[PDB]
Design a protein around this motif. Structure first.
Motif, mmCIF file in Angstrom:
data_model
loop_
_atom_site.group_PDB
_atom_site.id
_atom_site.type_symbol
_atom_site.label_atom_id
_atom_site.label_comp_id
_atom_site.label_asym_id
_atom_site.label_seq_id
_atom_site.Cartn_x
_atom_site.Cartn_y
_atom_site.Cartn_z
ATOM 1 N N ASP A 132 -21.337 135.129 59.670
ATOM 2 C CA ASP A 132 -21.135 134.378 60.909
ATOM 3 C C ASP A 132 -20.325 133.124 60.616
ATOM 4 N N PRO A 133 -19.090 133.062 61.142
ATOM 5 C CA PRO A 133 -18.213 131.911 60.901
ATOM 6 C C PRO A 133 -18.856 130.616 61.390
ATOM 7 N N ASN A 134 -19.736 130.725 62.385
ATOM 8 C CA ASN A 134 -20.280 129.545 63.054
ATOM 9 C C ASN A 134 -21.449 128.876 62.339
ATOM 10 N N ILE A 135 -22.090 129.594 61.417
ATOM 11 C CA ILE A 135 -23.246 129.040 60.702
ATOM 12 C C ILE A 135 -23.525 129.732 59.344
ATOM 13 N N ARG A 136 -23.896 128.945 58.334
ATOM 14 C CA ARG A 136 -24.194 129.472 56.989
ATOM 15 C C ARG A 136 -25.473 130.314 56.929
ATOM 16 N N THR A 137 -25.528 131.221 55.956
ATOM 17 C CA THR A 137 -26.624 132.198 55.829
ATOM 18 C C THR A 137 -28.033 131.605 55.869
ATOM 19 N N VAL A 138 -28.298 130.634 54.998
ATOM 20 C CA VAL A 138 -29.629 130.024 54.950
ATOM 21 C C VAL A 138 -29.846 129.041 56.119
ATOM 22 N N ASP A 139 -28.762 128.445 56.618
ATOM 23 C CA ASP A 139 -28.851 127.584 57.800
ATOM 24 C C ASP A 139 -29.403 128.405 58.978
ATOM 25 N N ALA A 140 -28.872 129.615 59.154
ATOM 26 C CA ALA A 140 -29.292 130.499 60.247
ATOM 27 C C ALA A 140 -30.771 130.892 60.153
ATOM 28 N N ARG A 142 -33.223 129.094 58.469
ATOM 29 C CA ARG A 142 -34.034 127.899 58.687
ATOM 30 C C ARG A 142 -34.156 127.649 60.199
ATOM 31 N N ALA A 143 -33.027 127.717 60.903
ATOM 32 C CA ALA A 143 -32.993 127.487 62.348
ATOM 33 C C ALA A 143 -33.884 128.452 63.119
ATOM 34 N N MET A 144 -34.035 129.668 62.608
ATOM 35 C CA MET A 144 -34.752 130.716 63.325
ATOM 36 C C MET A 144 -36.232 130.778 62.940
ATOM 37 N N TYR A 145 -36.562 130.341 61.721
ATOM 38 C CA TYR A 145 -37.899 130.560 61.158
ATOM 39 C C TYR A 145 -38.535 129.301 60.590
ATOM 40 N N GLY A 146 -37.752 128.233 60.487
ATOM 41 C CA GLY A 146 -38.273 126.981 59.963
ATOM 42 C C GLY A 146 -38.305 126.938 58.449
ATOM 43 N N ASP A 147 -38.867 125.858 57.913
ATOM 44 C CA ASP A 147 -38.785 125.552 56.485
ATOM 45 C C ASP A 147 -39.726 126.353 55.580
ATOM 46 N N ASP A 148 -40.741 126.998 56.152
ATOM 47 C CA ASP A 148 -41.699 127.742 55.334
ATOM 48 C C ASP A 148 -41.351 129.228 55.211
ATOM 49 N N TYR A 149 -40.259 129.626 55.859
ATOM 50 C CA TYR A 149 -39.703 130.965 55.681
ATOM 51 C C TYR A 149 -39.409 131.169 54.190
ATOM 52 N N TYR A 150 -39.764 132.332 53.641
ATOM 53 C CA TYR A 150 -39.693 132.522 52.190
ATOM 54 C C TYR A 150 -38.348 132.127 51.566
ATOM 55 N N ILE A 151 -37.237 132.503 52.196
ATOM 56 C CA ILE A 151 -35.923 132.239 51.609
ATOM 57 C C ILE A 151 -35.551 130.752 51.625
ATOM 58 N N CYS A 152 -36.036 130.008 52.627
ATOM 59 C CA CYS A 152 -35.840 128.558 52.625
ATOM 60 C C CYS A 152 -36.698 127.955 51.514
ATOM 61 N N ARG A 153 -37.898 128.494 51.341
ATOM 62 C CA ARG A 153 -38.810 128.009 50.310
ATOM 63 C C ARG A 153 -38.369 128.372 48.884
ATOM 64 N N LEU A 268 -35.112 138.691 61.278
ATOM 65 C CA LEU A 268 -33.698 138.293 61.356
ATOM 66 C C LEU A 268 -32.857 139.117 62.342
ATOM 67 N N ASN A 269 -33.515 139.647 63.375
ATOM 68 C CA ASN A 269 -32.872 140.502 64.379
ATOM 69 C C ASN A 269 -32.103 141.666 63.764
ATOM 70 N N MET A 270 -32.584 142.136 62.615
ATOM 71 C CA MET A 270 -31.904 143.180 61.863
ATOM 72 C C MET A 270 -31.967 144.508 62.613
ATOM 73 N N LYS A 271 -33.074 144.757 63.310
ATOM 74 C CA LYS A 271 -33.232 146.024 64.034
ATOM 75 C C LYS A 271 -32.177 146.182 65.126
ATOM 76 N N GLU A 272 -31.886 145.082 65.814
ATOM 77 C CA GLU A 272 -30.792 145.040 66.778
ATOM 78 C C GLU A 272 -29.429 145.241 66.105
ATOM 79 N N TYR A 273 -29.168 144.511 65.017
ATOM 80 C CA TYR A 273 -27.899 144.658 64.293
ATOM 81 C C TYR A 273 -27.721 146.090 63.786
ATOM 82 N N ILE A 274 -28.787 146.655 63.229
ATOM 83 C CA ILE A 274 -28.723 147.997 62.662
ATOM 84 C C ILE A 274 -28.391 149.057 63.720
ATOM 85 N N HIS A 275 -29.236 149.159 64.749
ATOM 86 C CA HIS A 275 -29.133 150.218 65.763
ATOM 87 C C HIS A 275 -28.257 149.844 66.972
ATOM 88 N N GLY A 276 -28.188 148.552 67.297
ATOM 89 C CA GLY A 276 -27.493 148.092 68.494
ATOM 90 C C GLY A 276 -25.986 148.313 68.539
#
Length: 318
Positions: A132-140, A142-153, A268-276
């Motif tokens: 996504d040109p508009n936002i970095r991978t881990v930024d996206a 953190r924004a969606m799941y907050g700071d305790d999301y495993y990958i942010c942690r 991470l809305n992966m189910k939508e990305y995958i099948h949508g």
């Protein structure tokens, strides 16, 4: 197992443990986190015996493979650097590519940079991480799941390592391997606690033996988790460095397979990305997406026979 050939090669300035067996066109297996070449044990045996050369390395930082001390040595370009060098040692122009979890992200980079070297790709668990040109991978994340999301942690150096040390290497591996709970893993603040699995069984599920766990433990108690954790710590840097491929398509033939309870598939809305439609839009020759009912993240181990045959059928078309 007893016939599997282990050796150490030099690729891209490091020493890499390589496991292999068989003869034929190469099937190169890329494991993820927190695993080892060992994770592919059933696939190694299987495709070996159907006229293919099964190659499964320990990736940079894992197992008996060299683990550079610097966080910056674990960008996707370093890893793919290791693998292109390995593919040149094998002596072939093209490979069949089978990958899972972090191994699959690497595999996508490998298909992005050298589509010509990959005949066809069986991707498990993690689909293309669309840039996504508009936002970095881990930024996206953190924004969606907050700071305790495993990958942010996983980001801050030394921190997750200390937390994992407190509960123990064996508990962490058992914790992660046995998880069947869907949705974004969100940690308790300041500690590992129950981590990925608030419902750990007394006995291991039947796809995993006490010896299997002990092999993982034997390696991780020695290497630690830092090398593997450093991959996540380069997600934003990978995103920055992959600008040249923004808006690009991957023309390599892919077969995507996931357990239905995989945390990846169910976050991470992966189910939508995958099948949508987004996944196919990015990956024009993506074939039949396969969801395995009642199977969670570690599907090459939990549904080993199904996976073994899905791999063969797909590769034989070429």
């Amino acid at each position: 197992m007893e016939e599997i050939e282990h050796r150490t090669v030099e690729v891209n300035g490091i020493k890499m443990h390589v496991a292999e067996k068989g003869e034929g066109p190469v099937v190169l297996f890329l494991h993820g986190f927190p695993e080892l070449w060992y994770s592919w044990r059933h696939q190694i045996l299987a495709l070996s015996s159907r006229g293919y050369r099964a190659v499964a390395p320990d990736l940079r930082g894992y197992g008996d493979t060299e683990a550079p001390v610097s966080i910056s040595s674990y960008t996707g370009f370093h890893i793919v650097g290791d693998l292109i060098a390995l593919i040149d040692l094998l002596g072939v122009d093209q490979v069949f590519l089978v990958a899972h979890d972090w191994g699959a992200i690497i595999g996508w980079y490998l298909c992005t940079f050298h589509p010509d070297r990959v005949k066809a790709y069986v991707c498990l668990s993690v689909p293309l991480l669309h840039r996504d040109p508009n936002i970095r991978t881990v930024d996206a994340m953190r924004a969606m799941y907050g700071d305790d999301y495993y990958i942010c942690r996983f980001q801050k150096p030394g921190e997750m390592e200390a937390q994992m040390a407190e509960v123990g290497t064996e508990y962490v591996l058992k914790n992660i391997l046995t998880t069947r709970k869907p949705g974004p893993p969100i940690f308790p603040k300041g500690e590992y606690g129950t981590g990925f699995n608030p419902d750990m069984p007394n006995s291991l599920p039947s796809w995993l033996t006490q010896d299997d766990l002990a092999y993982y433990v034997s390696k991780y108690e020695k290497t630690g988790f830092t090398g593997p954790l450093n991959y996540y710590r380069n997600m934003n840097l990978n995103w920055e460095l992959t600008a040249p491929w923004s808006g690009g398509k991957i023309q390599v033939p892919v077969k995507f397979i996931t357990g239905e309870l995989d945390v990846v598939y169910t976050s991470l809305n992966m189910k939508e990305y995958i099948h949508g439609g987004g996944f196919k839009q990015d990956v024009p020759n993506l074939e039949e997406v396969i969801v395995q009912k009642n199977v969670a993240h570690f599907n090459n181990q939990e549904a080993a026979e199904e996976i073994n045959n899905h791999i063969y059928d797909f590769i034989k078309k070429f």
